[PDB]
Design a protein around this nucleic acid. Structure first.
Ligand SMILES: [Mn+2]
Ligand SMILES: [Mn+2]
Ligand SMILES: [Mn+2]
Ligand SMILES: [Mn+2]
Ligand code: NA
Ligand code: NA
Ligand code: NA
Length: 320
DNA sequence: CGGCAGTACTG
DNA sequence: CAGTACT
DNA sequence: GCCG
């Protein structure tokens, strides 16, 4: 990154807008930040700034103040609530609205939350693991978690295929959580396995808490056995084989990569989701779907890229 | 002016 | 439904 | 916040 002295300041404002609920302004900041973090050269001119897709006059103005003064005055006017809103929003299951409500009601510390807040079932689990869920794991540990799920799955049906996606599959050295996709080539045997699979992982002691238990996705908490182990977030999704390519593409991400591809598909009268790539999709003037279109066959990730007119990208170059 | 991805849970 | 979460 |  050639523009650390710029992006460090702007990320502070991005986080401030985000925890305060100003989601679209925060998205603009996030995009400008990766745009600036990807430019080879330090930015030198106002005219240099606007050159960058994702930087307009407002952002260019800010960048100029930074290079001429070394600072951004807006930083000095960020609300005192923001560190607390960030503290509270880092509880799994609490977002901006819950954080703002707790702040309004006078809460200022996790001790206040523990002793006085009404927590949802998910939020009480998030609070209990507050520190663990903010720590990343070595990818070696993500492998052990993937293999634990796979052995429990393959015990029920040898044909089940399990793949760790997310940051693991993009090849990162550390992972925030483990994202496991499960399917079955026979197009049938994936059905109703959650019952037995989660029960199997629970009877081990491996699964320690459940956050979401849906028909197709599970979000929870695990911990490998032995000393020196932290609780880790684990997500599992079970999909039919006909959706494997799109599910793999979705679950591998990154998030910004997925949003970029989905926006591209929209421009082409298409729609991309974790289930399918569709064409001839009918939308209103508001960008909203009002007609479903036709599902396109996508046996592999490469086919999704091809049907969108894009060169194929390995998971590691999807780390946007 | 107005979209900014598309979807699944939860209560 | 609003809220939060997933990539 | 940016951009079509
Ligand atoms: Mn992940
Ligand atoms: Mn995850
Ligand atoms: Mn722990
Ligand atoms: Mn994530
Ligand atoms: Na620009
Ligand atoms: Na949260
Ligand atoms: Na009180």
């Amino acid at each position: 990154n050639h523009n650390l002295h710029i992006t460090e300041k702007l990320e502070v404002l991005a986080k401030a807008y985000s925890v305060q609920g100003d989601k679209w302004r925060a998205l603009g900041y996030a995009k400008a930040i990766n745009a600036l973090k990807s430019f080879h050269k330090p930015v030198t001119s106002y005219q240099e700034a606007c050159s960058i897709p994702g930087i307009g006059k407002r952002m260019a103005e800010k960048i100029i103040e930074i290079l001429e003064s070394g600072h951004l005055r807006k930083l000095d006017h960020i609300s005192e609530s923001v560190p607390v809103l960030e503290l509270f929003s880092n509880i799994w299951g609490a977002g901006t609205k819950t954080a703002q409500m707790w702040y309004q009601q006078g809460f200022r510390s996790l001790e206040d939350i523990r002793s006085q807040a009404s927590l949802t079932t998910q939020q009480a689990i998030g609070l209990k693991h507050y520190s663990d869920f903010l720590e990343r794991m070595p990818r070696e540990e993500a492998t052990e978690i993937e293999q634990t799920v796979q052995k429990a799955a393959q015990a029920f049906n040898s044909g089940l295929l399990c793949v760790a996606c997310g940051s693991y599959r993009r090849g990162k050295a550390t992972c925030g959580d483990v994202d496991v996709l499960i399917t079955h080539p026979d197009g049938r045997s994936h059905r109703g396995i959650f019952s037995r699979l989660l029960d199997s992982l629970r009877q081990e002691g491996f699964l320690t808490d459940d956050l979401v238990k849906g028909e197709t996705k599970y979000l929870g908490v695990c911990r490998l056995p032995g000393p020196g182990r932290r609780h880790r977030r684990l997500d599992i999704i079970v999909v039919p084989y006909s959706e494997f390519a799109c599910a793999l593409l979705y679950f591998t991400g990154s998030a910004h990569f997925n949003r970029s591809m989905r926006a591209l598909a929209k421009t082409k009268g298409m729609s991309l989701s974790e289930h399918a790539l569709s064409t001839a999709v009918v939308r209103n003037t508001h960008g909203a779907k009002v007609g479903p279109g036709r599902v396109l066959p996508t046996p592999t990730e490469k086919d999704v890229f091809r049907l969108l007119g894009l060169p194929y990208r390995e998971p590691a170059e999807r780390d946007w």
